[PDB]
Amino acid sequence: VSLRTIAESLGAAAAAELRAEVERDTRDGVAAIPPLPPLGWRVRHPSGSNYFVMTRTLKNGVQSAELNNRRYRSVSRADVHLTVFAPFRVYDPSLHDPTVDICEWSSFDLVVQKTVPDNMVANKLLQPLSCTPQDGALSMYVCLASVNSEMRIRSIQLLSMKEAQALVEHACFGNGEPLFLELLRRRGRRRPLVERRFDDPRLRYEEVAQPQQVADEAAVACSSSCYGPYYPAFEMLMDSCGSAGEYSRALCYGGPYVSELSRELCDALLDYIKGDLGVSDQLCEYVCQMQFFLEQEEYMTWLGQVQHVANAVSRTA
Amino acid sequence: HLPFNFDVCYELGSREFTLFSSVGSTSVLVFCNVSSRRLRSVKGGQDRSPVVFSAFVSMPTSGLTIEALCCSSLGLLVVDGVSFHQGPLTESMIPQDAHPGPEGHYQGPLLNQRSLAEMVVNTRGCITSVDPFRQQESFFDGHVNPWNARSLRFGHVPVHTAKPGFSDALCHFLEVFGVNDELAFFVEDFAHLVHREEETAWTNVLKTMM
């Protein structure tokens, strides 16, 4: 008897909170437009998730970027594949320590991979290219941070199939790591979550399954590569969502201290990521906006699940 | 003291105890991970980590499983987060034996401003250093490494802190399933019992070794 009036009070409050939530962002009947990503980026956000990934493919190298293409008018290489993992992890460190003058600290990861096409003719076999999935599958894991709307690099890691083979076979004297082997022993797959497509508007209707095509383009290339059985150890090494992937990337080198580097190196690495690679502060400000918008989108689904649970209890009690 | 229908599952060597219940077709599961560093006193007055646990209440009639992050303070109960998971209580969802539950899901809004209320009384939080890599020396530990703790939202403070009139009905909705302050008074006292039995076993093992 008293369980009915409690479950109906919560279901009426969750229906009123969701009614008052959509009323705040509504502007004269028009709902809240999501923030626009930069050109070429296709954001995929799973429903009921804590993260969203966006992809970018620079054909014919980095010279097809946004900064290298703008010029003044009226007067081959390997392709680059970008992937920005952006979780909802954003916090303020001035509360725990008031000596730090930081208003916002948001972390997001960037994985950049390269793939040789069959169209380049100039530099075929002068040197064996180590960025190819056939030869080592070298990839750069640049962990970034947005420190008061300013992009700061946290770590620059260079991971190949050798580092996944070393951690699984001979990280110790004669064995692998006892914790990295144990984390590979407990790898259960996630249920398929329906992803939402907040892509760039110019590439929203061009092709839909292009990041799905480029995800299995490297997946069939690396499992059938020179390094064959070490790809399950490499996918968990490149797993950007979870604690097993962050521990596995901590077993590798993790790069040098960036503030201990030369200042000519720090400006050249910032000129490469922002200028050449295209991952700029326009994207870095967008990630914190997209972390804020999809937190609002997941709060409404959370309010819908409070109403869905509380109505299911009172109809049975 | 003990609640009405709750079995305790505790093995010596692990700093974990789990409480289970089942009323009708619904099952409510409470898991706690006792801190090894230091736990707060039951008197409260005089590094001093609070006893924070989880509550998994599963209802097959709704099709969802509610995860309730609960913190026991002075024998009472507060709730910091409520999240929803698909299906009934699978074994992988419970953080027993150092394998976590479902990761990469929405944690939920702040139901209460308890952690900001500890800032005015100058009580130190779990985040001792602002450097996240400094606390990643003791990885896979919720008390020492808050950046990978499921119970501490992996160091993230959410955007929405829920309405007081709305979040009061959510606390009353879970208290009919046995997540009241009578349960948290037992968890507060059993965590001090696990913390002493783990310490006297670790000492007597260390005596015979040397």
Binding site: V22, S47, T301, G304, Q305, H308 | P60, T61, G63, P88
Partner: peptide
Amino acid sequence: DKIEKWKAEGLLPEDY
């Protein structure tokens, strides 16, 4: 329209 979408996504399931 959002609750219609969440039942298609599976976030609001049926009776188990």
